[PDB]
Amino acid sequence: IVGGYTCGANTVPYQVSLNSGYHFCGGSLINSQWVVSAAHCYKSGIQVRLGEDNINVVEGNEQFISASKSIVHPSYNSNTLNNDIMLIKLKSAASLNSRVASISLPTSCASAGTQCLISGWGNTKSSGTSYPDVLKCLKAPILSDSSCKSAYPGQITSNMFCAGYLEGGKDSCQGDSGGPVVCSGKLQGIVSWGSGCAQKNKPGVYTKVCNYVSWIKQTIASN
Ligand SMILES: *P(=O)(O)[C@@H](NC(=O)OCc1ccccc1)c1ccc(C(=N)N)cc1
Numbered sequence: 453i454v455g456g457y458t459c460g461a462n463t464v465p466y467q468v469s470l471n472s473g474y475h476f477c478g479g480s481l482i483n484s485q486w487v488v489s490a491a492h493c494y495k496s497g498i499q500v501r502l503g504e505d506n507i508n509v510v511e512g513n514e515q516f517i518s519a520s521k522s523i524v525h526p527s528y529n530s531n532t533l534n535n536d537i538m539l540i541k542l543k544s545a546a547s548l549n550s551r552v553a554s555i556s557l558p559t560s561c562a563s564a565g566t567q568c569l570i571s572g573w574g575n576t577k578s579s580g581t582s583y584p585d586v587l588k589c590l591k592a593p594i595l596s597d598s599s600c601k602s603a604y605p606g607q608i609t610s611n612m613f614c615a616g617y618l619e620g621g622k623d624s625c626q627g628d629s630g631g632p633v634v635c636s637g638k639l640q641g642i643v644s645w646g647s648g649c650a651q652k653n654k655p656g657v658y659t660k661v662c663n664y665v666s667w668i669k670q671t672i673a674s675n
């Protein structure tokens with residue numbers, strides 16, 4: 453996160469760190485045994501890390517649980533990033549408590565103008581490269597389908613929305629992928645792509661999670 457602020461230890465109880473020896477992506481816990489993230493973050497050997505604030509230090513509230521499985525969206529296109537969503541079932545269920553908690557799924561899509569919260573451990577600088585330790589947060593608005601298309605002619609599908617500031621200066625960045633965009637308590641977006649980070653007229657682009665609620669629900673009922 454570029455241009456955001458330090459969240460405060462465990463104030464985003466649903467934020468997940470995906471680690472394969474090092475944090476490579478973020479995620480969102482959606483129930484005792486499942487995490488949603490971006491399908492562009494798939495690889496094998498993922499250990500979900502819940503209860504994290506500083507990812508380089510054991511501070512006491514973590515649950516590190518290996519992935520028993522991952523299901524990348526059947527229609528994921530890595531080239532276009534259309535359908536950038538994947539589900540991660542945990543080896544063991546997590547103990548949910550005030551500091552470790554699941555986010556609820558959307559029953560409706562959020563519209564343009566709705567302010568959300570994007571969080572992650574990704575790069576903070578659009579200057580010399582710098583990765584943090586503790587979770588950064590950014591409050592930011594979903595933009596209009598039209599400004600988003602105007603900003604990326606030809607690349608925005610119906611499962612994509614933009615969120616951010618066309619002025620530049622605040623955005624998500626490398627390493628933030630797969631993590632949350634929560635608006636009014638609902639996980640509405642998954643951090644997916646953008647052109648550079650925090651640049652003028654190039655906002656963050658997010659998987660429109662409301663489009664997948666049915667697939668998610670059906671997958672968790674059978675896996
Ligand atoms: P994420 O992996 O942290 C990152 N996306 C990533 O680099 O891969 C997708 C990609 C597709 C096409 C060209 C480049 C990258 C990411 C997430 C959010 C932003 C952002 N500016 N909001 C940037 C990169």
Ligand SMILES: [Ca+2]
Binds near residue numbers: 503505507511514
């Ligand atoms: Ca930690």
